[PDB]
Amino acid sequence: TRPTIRPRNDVVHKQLSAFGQYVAEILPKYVQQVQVSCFNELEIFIHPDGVIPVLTFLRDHTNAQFKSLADLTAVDVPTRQNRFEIVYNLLSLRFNSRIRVKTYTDELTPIESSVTVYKAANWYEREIWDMFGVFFANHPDLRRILTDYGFEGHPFRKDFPLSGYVELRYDDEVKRVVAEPVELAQEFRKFDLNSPWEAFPAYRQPPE
């Protein structure tokens, strides 16, 4: 029955909710909100100061042994004052479960490096600094990865144009590859695809 729709597993939902309450109780100082998605994923929202403490708690077995940092990334939502949402994805092989811890930052506010806790966050935090503008304090070596050696802007920032501000070409006069202002021969055609009609009534925001 209901072949198209995805099957739901309530057992995992209850287990994740219970463990989320467990974490919230153990560290009330930093955890602000814990929610479990209906696809059975647990998210704990933390104050920026609690990254190292909460991550160290999660890695060490207080009935939780998340000893693998799946990925670390940021989501830039310009509307929010803290435009960057730092996201940590952890994996516990002992309990075969994954949880996500999320924190916020601004362009000018540093966030502590997690290289001490996990040691896989060196390159992830460097990428976060390179694309987004977040600075991670006490990082062993914070420098650019994935961008050109002289790149000035921070891409992935929702302000940076997709094509950028500069372009590279070889110039015979200087016998060198020289940057120049971007001049697209075919401007990227912006398509307005959003429909005027609401698709999901469940997520309807309050009229306010």
């Binding site: 009330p28 929202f45 077995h61 207080t62 939502v77």
Partner: protein
Amino acid sequence: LKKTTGLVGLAVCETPHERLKILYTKILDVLGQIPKNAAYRKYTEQITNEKLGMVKAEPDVKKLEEQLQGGQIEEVILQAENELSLARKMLRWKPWEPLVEEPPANQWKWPI
């Protein structure tokens, strides 16, 4: 006596029961310093006391590993050491205290 733990970098412990007893006792000692009503202390003590009782009750390494469900006993001792370090850092962090600051008005609202 198992020839190898099977995981590189982890060595067979000749005296597993003694090591586990010492580590759990130290963890309980550190937990004692933590305030009584702190959830960390209550839960960690609950887990530790269960583990220590299991370790004392069972004299066989394989039976103890089956009972603990923490993998090979060397992994259990490693987890105990990790717990001890956490407990020690917890004392400094004092996570049991109230929330440092509530988030901005709509810092966790999605969709925007």
